[PDB]
Amino acid sequence: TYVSLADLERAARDVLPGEIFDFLAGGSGTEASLVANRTALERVFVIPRMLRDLTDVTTEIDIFGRRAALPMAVAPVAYQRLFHPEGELAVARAARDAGVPYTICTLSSVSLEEIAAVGGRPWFQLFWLRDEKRSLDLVRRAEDAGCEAIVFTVDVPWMGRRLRDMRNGFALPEWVTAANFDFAPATWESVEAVRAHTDLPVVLKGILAVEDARRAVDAGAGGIVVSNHGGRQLDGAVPGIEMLGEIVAAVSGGCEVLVDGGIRSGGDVLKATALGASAVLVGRPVMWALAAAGQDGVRQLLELLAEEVRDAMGLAGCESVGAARRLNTKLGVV
Amino acid sequence: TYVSLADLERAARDVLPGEIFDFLAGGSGTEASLVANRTALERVFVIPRMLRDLTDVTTEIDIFGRRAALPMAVAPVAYQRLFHPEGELAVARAARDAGVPYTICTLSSVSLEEIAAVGGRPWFQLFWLRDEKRSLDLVRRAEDAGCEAIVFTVDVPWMGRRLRDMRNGFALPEWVTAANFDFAPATWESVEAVRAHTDLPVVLKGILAVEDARRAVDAGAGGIVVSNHGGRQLDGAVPGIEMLGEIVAAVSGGCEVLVDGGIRSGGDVLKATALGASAVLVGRPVMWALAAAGQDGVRQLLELLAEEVRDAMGLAGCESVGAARRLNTKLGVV
Amino acid sequence: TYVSLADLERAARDVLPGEIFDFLAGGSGTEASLVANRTALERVFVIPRMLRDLTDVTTEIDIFGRRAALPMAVAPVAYQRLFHPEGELAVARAARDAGVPYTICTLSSVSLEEIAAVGGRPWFQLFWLRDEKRSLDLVRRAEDAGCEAIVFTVDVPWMGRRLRDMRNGFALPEWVTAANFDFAPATWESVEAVRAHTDLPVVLKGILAVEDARRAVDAGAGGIVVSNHGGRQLDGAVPGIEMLGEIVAAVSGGCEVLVDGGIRSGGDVLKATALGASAVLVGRPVMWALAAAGQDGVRQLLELLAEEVRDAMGLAGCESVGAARRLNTKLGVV
Amino acid sequence: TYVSLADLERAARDVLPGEIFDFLAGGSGTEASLVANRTALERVFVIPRMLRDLTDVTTEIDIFGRRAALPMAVAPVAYQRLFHPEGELAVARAARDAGVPYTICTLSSVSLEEIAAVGGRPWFQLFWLRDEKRSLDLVRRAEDAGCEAIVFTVDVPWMGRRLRDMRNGFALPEWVTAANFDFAPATWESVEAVRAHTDLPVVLKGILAVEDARRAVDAGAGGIVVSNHGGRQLDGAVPGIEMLGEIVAAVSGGCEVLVDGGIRSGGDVLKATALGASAVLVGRPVMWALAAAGQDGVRQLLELLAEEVRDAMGLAGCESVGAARRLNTKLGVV
Ligand SMILES: Cc1cc2nc3c(=O)[nH]c(=O)nc-3n(C[C@H](O)[C@H](O)[C@H](O)COP(=O)(O)O)c2cc1C
Ligand SMILES: Cc1cc2nc3c(=O)[nH]c(=O)nc-3n(C[C@H](O)[C@H](O)[C@H](O)COP(=O)(O)O)c2cc1C
Ligand SMILES: Cc1cc2nc3c(=O)[nH]c(=O)nc-3n(C[C@H](O)[C@H](O)[C@H](O)COP(=O)(O)O)c2cc1C
Ligand SMILES: Cc1cc2nc3c(=O)[nH]c(=O)nc-3n(C[C@H](O)[C@H](O)[C@H](O)COP(=O)(O)O)c2cc1C
Description:
The structure is a homotetramer. By secondary structure, chain A is α/β, with parallel strands linked by helices. Chain A has helices at about 5-15, 20-25, 30-45, 85-100, 110-115, 130-145, 165-170, 190-195, 210-220, 240-250, 265-275, 285-315, 320-325, and strands at about 45, 60-65, 65-70, 70-75, 100-105, 120-125, 150-155, 200-205, 225, 255-260, 280, 330. In chain A, strands 4-11-10-9-8-7-6-5 form an eight-stranded parallel beta sheet. A two-stranded antiparallel ribbon of chain A has the order 1-12. In chain A, helix 1 (about 5-15) packs antiparallel against helix 12 (about 285-315), helix 4 runs parallel beside helix 12 and helix 9 crosses helix 10 (about 240-250). Chain A is globular. The relative contact order of chain A is 0.21. The interface of C and D includes residues 265 and 271 of C. The complex binds flavin mononucleotide (FMN) (4 copies). The PDB classes it as flavoprotein. Keywords: FMN-dependent oxidase, flavoprotein.
């Protein structure tokens, strides 16, 4: 019986080999951006409303043409067999059962077609390959398999310098592979190539600059994820949560605006919503639950988050996520 | 001989069973709002005035048609028999003797009529019940027993997630019951039903949004308590002390504006007053005194607070609470 | 060979009985204002100037018609025989030899006439007595003995609540007495009575509100000391250093504006000057030096401060204290 | 295999005698400015750009008429034989091989002509001597030896009070001397004398005030280094990084604007660039590498920095240093 997401981290730490825990937990450089994701959320306080009608409180949203049970999706995390033998299938099954979209990775350790076969609301995360033709074939595979959005990761021209992994000499075990296979920096031209080759909504993940958010809308993106990649890419990149309010104002409803980085409770989901987010992604906590107890662990995590989101919304006087978006916030200290 | 309110916490910790101490001390979630109540007060510095006439320094106020000895009332705290066998009677007696209003709880462990019989300035705190008729009968009982205000708690559509209590598996002992008995979310319609059924001032406890404060005045409230429920309801709710100045400006004398959360000295009372509060509520410290030494403990606490309030006022050049409200403040760090 | 003022605190702690060290070190309440005096100085950074003429660097100022060797005076500290058998005579002698004004206390443990006989630039600090006539006789004694300013302490309607002293049960030893004798709250009328009865400059010590600074000028004060009494009076009073810039602007040269609280180096003196102070008072460090090594200890402290002030001024491109007052500052963190 | 600059500090601490490590690490006074250099960098977050062309990422700049491989030069650090027997020759050789300018010190422990003979891009740092004629002869020597800029240090009218060195009784060993020999405060007249006597660009090191930056341009400086001398001069001097943005705006391209103090990674170089710096100087880390492993150590440090700079630039969407200068930043906490 886990009562917070932090209960799951302790459990994952006990079970995982240190180098794998470090691959999961770590960030780039001095981990300044990793820590700042948490610091930034902790500075935000919500101004709750009272005495509103809560007879029909609902945490549901519509996003990319589909109902989701919560304003949340499972973030793309590569190589989930690192954490549990069932890997992506355990996570996707639990996500399906919870009514939460699951993001299938380019670097999944089970093939995208197998994960999509689980059902639910799968999205597909794209890393741009060596040549346009292979990238587009990967998008086509995902679309053919029933994925409902393409989450194009745009903050990885190359992978950041993760010093825990360098110090550990971390490498994939032989029993974990990139199952979609037997990369080059993306540009705005790559985005256009993807947009031209699919009817699915294209979601640009890793936007932090206001003008990049505007340009994403102009480029025909259906959404963006305001994100510093969990502090794993540029060390010193601003937390997404700190850019979110400015970005939401600038796009002025032109696309869905998601955020990630450090979401660790329903209260944090509420903060993100109050700052203007359509929805959040959650990464590391899902993997802690997977490591701790497989599919059942992820189910328990999603049930806990669902309860915390409903609790936070109602306590703040919000019968819907739309109402939560209209909450005001105040910045505090420590 | 206690010289600060913190002397009483140490004493209460020694005597109380851990799970009861945790029920008293704890907040919801990560306890961010609990801690922020203290942090926020610690950031406020007063700009004292010098060389004023202090020949007749008085800490008295008039509130809801009655003189009070200090700008303070005992906050509603449920189930006071948890802390001492005399429970609410010990606290109400000490409050009476000190000239401080005592708030009788809906969830009192001694009946409201017995506590009101003690005398003094009893107020009655309402939680909205299952149906209008039982709620209003509770208000009528309180009024018939001589309670002088109805403190309608508006920040509890349901109880928050107190993780200490969940981890402890905390439950009321068999010897503690809700003595007023053998709940549903309140709305603005509930407030109107209460206002229509009593001549007593209705005070809305748990207001944080400026527009909710304005609407409280428009709804015919005689007062509000600007409060995050001691960090026990929404984890991440702004501290009341941080909204107080804005709220005081917005209501512009249309109702009494009280504050609570983390008041732990006469200096803190002065800070609250300087930010515009009519009066404060004090919760946990009263219960520490009750646990430590029963009625005599609460008397000693109230005597200590009275001395600290008079000391702080005079040192700041204020011969009256009204003068303290005209003090300016400056925000600092740590 | 002491290289910082902090070397002297360690030495004083070793030699003094704990309760006496606590009388010296302590503040009122939770010691929030005591700590904030240091925090506030630590937040201030100086913007030094380069490449100026430093051929004739001088730390001298003119204040209340007399040259002083540094922009500094010894603060009034009662009962200096607590710290060393020679008490006030040791401190006054060292101050004289260093060219620094010494403030003789109303509650001195050696008579004001004996201390004034030492020579140098004595000032006299007044606490307002029971009746106008005794207060004025004390002022007349000081003037007759050759004191050159009256430092009227205006932040002590009564003494603050020093919890270290209460916990220790601290009392003066039989061998320490108020040697000027065999009190009531001061008002603006008291200030006028003093101003009318002396040709000496009257300096109001303990001003924090901007309007009190203006009123001090209007009342005919020759100076003010912007001060929270070393955090010993109102716990939660703003540090003087945080009000200094606003106060300097408001009086616009109408009187001398001194500051105290937490000055612990020549760099701190420079910060105070850059914020607009005419001069600083230094309290506790002088007593650490007295406790550590008597008159010689105070001489060494004043020599160290003199070197640090000259060093800081020159490094900041200031050939005079007037130039230091024209330096700009920037607030930082921790 | 060092993966961060902090790996080199640990290695230098192990090998160096404590008093030499302290000479290197220490600052003046309480070391407030030393610590603030790091604090200030840690507060800066970069807003990276995405999806830009990175086909030809280059870290090169042109400065003072010469290409440099990175926007970085080795700061002037006196007496490098303190740290390794090869001293300045080891550092200059590694700098040459890395394509980074090396600043030869007035107080070098190997003669300026020997160090310049190493080749590369040597600059020469000037301390103003006793008389104009010797100062100018030193400038002429440097110019004759092929130095390409004169870095006139302007923040040392005299040396600051380094308390670690005073406590240690630190003195140069007999085997370390000022090899350029067998000082007086600089002024603007000194700057003019230097500018009139050389065709080399004159760079004023130790500017913090905006008006001093403007006056440097008016005086014919080719550059400035915005710097508090690594917290070794005025204790309480603002960090250069905190003045940089204001200074860059004020000079509006009239000279090169460099910064130093606490640069410890390629991410920090990126922050400095984003705040408007043309280039940075790096001091202590170069000496840690020298102490740890001589010339090879410095080579490894410069290779690590080069990789971190390229990584940070690309992750932030910058194909050139000019692009990095156009990045925006956001201030955060801790
Ligand atoms: C172990 C690990 C692997 C990741 N793999 C990917 C990936 O393949 N693609 C991607 O776009 N993001 C990846 N991310 C970033 C996440 O999608 C997400 O942005 C980040 O974890 C921030 O969320 P968190 O604090 O909830 O973990 C990964 C993160 C982690 C920790
Ligand atoms: C143990 C406990 C029980 C409480 N019970 C109630 C209650 O029944 N009704 C209510 O309106 N507030 C209740 N409160 C909230 C208090 O009235 C008050 O808002 C809160 O304790 C903040 O004040 P403090 O920091 O002085 O404790 C309770 C608080 C505590 C700690
Ligand atoms: C032990 C002690 C005794 C003091 N006595 C007096 C006094 O008699 N009159 C007065 O105006 N201030 C008195 N002060 C306040 C000082 O004059 C000064 O305002 C305060 O110490 C702040 O300076 P510091 O941080 O340099 O100690 C006293 C302070 C201390 C610590
Ligand atoms: C041991 C030591 C010696 C130094 N010697 C000089 C010098 O001779 N001339 C000079 O202009 N700066 C000197 N500096 C200052 C550096 O050039 C530079 O401004 C400072 O170290 C800040 O950079 P850092 O944090 O990268 O060390 C010295 C610094 C150190 C630590």
